[PDB]
């Protein structure tokens, strides 16, 4: 039934190889936050030569299955990975921090095996407004996963972009009300904050 959903971008990938090879292509891997990014600010991707490959609802396991077709075969200079939100959501099954982290490491190793540079990013803050303990538990699980990612990134000299620290508001780490409406997906103002951070990091890598 095409569990990884390679069908979603199969035709779009064909149209890209037909348009030729591009200089300094950046592919964005992620879920609805990344898919909605292109839908909400098409100019940011069009004007900069960025290619969005987000699919809503997907986990880091889906991203690993799509990595070769949706990243490697597009011969990009750089890949931006944002993964973990739906792993934690458990819409596809029980969360396992070690499995999620391992999927990210597998994607990094596939990218480096193909001379594709990597930028790792933080799982975004997430609203769990049932009560205060629910929000704290959600925030603690996100920080715990991001801690694994940042330690791996530092150890392997991979840039890490910390969306979380700039978008999570006190006291319990809820996604800032200025940056969201549903507490999960950024608004355009929220995306503008992420764009400044990731563009600075991309430009440093691409030189």
């Amino acid at each position, epitope marked *: 039934q095409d569990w990884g959903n390679l069908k979603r971008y199969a035709e779009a990938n064909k149209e890209l190889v037909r348009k030729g090879k591009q200089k300094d292509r950046v592919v964005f891997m992620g879920n609805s936050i990344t898919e909605g990014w292109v839908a909400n600010d098409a100019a940011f991707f069009e004007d900069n030569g960025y290619v969005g490959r987000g699919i809503g609802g997907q986990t880091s396991s889906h991203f690993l299955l799509r990595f070769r077709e949706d990243v490697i075969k597009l011969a990009p200079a750089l890949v931006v990975i944002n993964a973990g939100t739906n792993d934690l959501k458990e819409n596809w099954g029980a969360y396992n*921090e070690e499995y999620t982290f391992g999927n990210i490491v597998s994607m990094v190793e596939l990218a480096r095996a193909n001379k594709i540079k990597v930028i790792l990013t933080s799982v975004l803050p997430h609203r769990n407004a049932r009560d205060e303990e629910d929000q704290k*538990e959600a925030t*603690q*699980a996100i920080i715990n996963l991001n*801690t694994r990612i*940042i330690n791996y990134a530092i150890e392997n000299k991979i840039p890490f972009v910390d969306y979380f620290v700039e978008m*999570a508001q006190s*006291p319990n780490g809820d996604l800032n009300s200025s940056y969201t409406r549903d507490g999960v997906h950024p608004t355009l103002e929220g995306y503008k904050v992420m764009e400044a951070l990731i563009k600075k990091a991309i430009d440093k890598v691409l030189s």
Partner: antibody
Amino acid sequence: QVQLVESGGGVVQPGRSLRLSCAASGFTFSTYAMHWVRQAPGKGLEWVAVISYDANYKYYADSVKGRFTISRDNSKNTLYLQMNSLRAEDTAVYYCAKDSQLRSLLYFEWLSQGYFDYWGQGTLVTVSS
Amino acid sequence: NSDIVMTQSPDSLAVSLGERATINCKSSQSVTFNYKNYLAWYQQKPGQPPKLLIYWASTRESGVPDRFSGSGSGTDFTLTISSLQAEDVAVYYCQQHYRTPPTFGQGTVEIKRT
């Protein structure tokens, strides 16, 4: 092996100040949060303060807030506790303690810490005239 | 007010040498998160600093003898000494580090005799 050596303790007049130091060795000090914990005579252990690996975040026990300042020098592998306006109830053996977690992200004051995997020998602070 | 409270009930226990010592610790709220128990045990002899005995509720630190074991989850935890040795007479601390401030509970093991 991991060593933590505290110094700076002694008898100090109420109201005065005192600076404790904790010299660390045997581990990459700059990548771990560090803690101060104290034990008053005949009492249990009371956590005092934590400082993140990069010194960006510091949190304190309510009992010392506004009077104590935790700091670190990662180039010297040394942790400090600056104690101001000392009171008789601050009398205790003060321990520095290493946090078990690598580069913990202490973005908020309530987040999980590690367990305290290594402790110093302690330095006695006696606040008395 | 929101600090997690650690309590040992009873807070003192007299155990005959050679017999089983069981120390119970209770937290005011669950300290288990993502299948991990944020509960540590420490031993302190007089004039000595505390020493880590058990971490993640049930993992012995290197060098700790086999007669020490920890168990429990959620709000109820136990430190067991299968056969009490004279060198095991000490103060014992249970510690949660699930939330800041990390907090400790205290109890003593003493030798029972006639």
